[PDB]
Amino acid sequence: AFKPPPRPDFGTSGRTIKLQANFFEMDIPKIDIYHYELDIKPCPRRVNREIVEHMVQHFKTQIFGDRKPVFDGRKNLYTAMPLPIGRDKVELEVTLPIFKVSIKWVSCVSLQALHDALSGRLPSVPFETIQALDVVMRHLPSMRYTPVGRSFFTASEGCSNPLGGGREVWFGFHQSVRPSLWKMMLNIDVSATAFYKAQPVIEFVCEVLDFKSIEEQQKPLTDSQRVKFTKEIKGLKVEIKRKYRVCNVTRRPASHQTFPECTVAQYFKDRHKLVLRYPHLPCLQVGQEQKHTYLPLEVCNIVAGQRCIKKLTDNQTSTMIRATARSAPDRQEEISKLMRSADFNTDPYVREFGIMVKDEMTDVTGRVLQPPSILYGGRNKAIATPVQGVWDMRNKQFHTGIEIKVWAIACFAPQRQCTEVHLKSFTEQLRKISRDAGMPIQGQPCFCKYAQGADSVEPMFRHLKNTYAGLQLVVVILPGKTPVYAEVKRVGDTVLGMATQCVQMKNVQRTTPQTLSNLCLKINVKLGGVNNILLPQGRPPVFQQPVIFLGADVTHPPAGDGKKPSIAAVVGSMDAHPNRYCATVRVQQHRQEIIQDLAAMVRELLIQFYKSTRFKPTRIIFYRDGVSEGQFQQVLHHELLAIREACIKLEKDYQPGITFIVVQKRHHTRLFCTDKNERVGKSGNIPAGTTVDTKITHPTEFDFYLCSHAGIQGTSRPSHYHVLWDDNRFSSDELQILTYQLCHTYVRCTRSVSIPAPAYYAHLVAFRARYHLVDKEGRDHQALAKAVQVHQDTLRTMYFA
């Protein structure tokens, strides 16, 4: 439970492919530079950046001589040459167009220590050095553009991109400094997010309430209109010179609205001497709730550069997607255009520190791994061969297909829309596809009844269970999006323990062989079948001893939410294929990534593995989704020990080797085909199986990019895998092949998915817990805990399929 293992070696498996990556090489000088600790009394980050930039111009002659200090926005200051004050304190103060600021100088950043650590000589990558370089690259754009996370956004000049509702698209780019096997690298990627337009509040009202012009509404707002407007502007800032956080939209129109004893229209009529157009419309209530200052819509401006944190509307989203949808070559060229346009070398603050940035994307050589063969059953024992990460189920039967003899249907769609004919049609079509797949639906359903409302579910289901012995499955037709779905799964998964398979009504009226086939995949698994397996003799050597494959993920509540729990999920392989998985799930602290009750969850799974296979795992392979580099030590420290605790409290001296792997699907590394005839499909992406464990990866540690999936649309996200611990001493080859093969064991489709199945199931388990908790989200905890606790008959199934 200490620092991660070193890179054991480099992969050798697979044919080579020429790739470009959105990493731009950095030439860093071999000099020392100087860290200073600031403290400003009393502020937003951008306000503090402003204090220093004005302060440096003001104490130029006294202190900062021809220097270009960079400032991280709070209390870290860096200079290329030392400041003529030495080792001691200084208390300065600056003017606002009020601030005492303290400058010390704690440290000297060696820099040349970075080159040596990048050479692997020094085991440690010095973080406090990498911190400093990022502050260099961020200093200037942090004031010109509008920061959001590690990115930067600005209004596109020459073009506008409205979304409606007073919003518009702002294009921008992500920026980050990372170390690598080769050099320091600048990772750049284009991005876009919704912003509020800096228009008159009057015109803001118009876009939200759907007026072409002011004069449509001539007398004060409707009850309906004043709340809808209020909901949209409250929390946004506005300007007149001066700043104001909008806090409320008043009840009375300006002319009638009053403050102590004068009225705002009257107040503006003589003090600032302008009658109001639109005296009918109300006033904004600004700043403090306790205080009584009210502002007219007329004189107000929506202040520029405020990110839109509310969820977009559906047509707003449509507009956003349409604007930013981009094939991989188009993506590549846009990154390139931006970077030649950025001209990071001209940046004076960059120039101060003598940093040089490469004009072009780095060239990197990847390898394309071979897909494993997939083994089906029935009589043929057919073998399927993934081609460009895809295969099909025609002319093949499940390795272990379930014979279905007792089953029922429950339609919650209106009969006028979903008729008995449609159901009968759909049934015959399904039975056909299912027999071909080795999953004979041997008879007609023993039950078929229309229903309406979530109220009718539990009684209908309790009936079925009490009546039809050996009942295997209930198929449930739904009219579309409905609360019934959440209800059907609550009763099935948690209350009665009954297999259910829902189908949207539209996919019943009109069915297709592909859709029905994918449906049988889900069904056969839910009823304990094995769809396929990896070709046994084609697996890596690790399968020669008993091994369990764990997948784990946390899912946090949406943006803006304050009290909903985070949900941890852990699944474990239950056979030697590996194919069958059992799941565990927990509610835990709001926005905690660390899986709190992991040890209990792993113990549960280890026991079930033994009852299933009658083997004890000699090794445990742990795939952990979603952890960032910043949280690697904390998570590993807690979660690695939790796995050990599980093993130790199970049996004395039961110490299986642990391999701990973090899976990151969401980062800002993008890989492109250098050679045009390597591109795959309309989107023009790199092929499935593409592997990069050199050049752009970590200088000392064990990590690699693997893109295991076909890229249908946009630009593919190659998944990054990072090994935080490995008792089993894997080689790069074996772990990459293992990880790649597990992307083929995902039962919901005949494709190679973007992450290993165990981790993918961990997502599906979490998301299902989220469905159990809909509108239900010491005594607080136990209620939610029980909401996600599945029935005893469900515990050992793949209900999450």
Add this chain to the structure above:
RNA sequence: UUCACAUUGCCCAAGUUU
């Protein structure tokens, strides 16, 4: 609620005188 892929929503980060 057939499914995958892609944009966003998720930990880190970011943000927090009328």
Add this chain to the structure above:
RNA sequence: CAAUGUGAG
């Protein structure tokens, strides 16, 4: 998983 797109035997 939700919204929105692109796709499949």
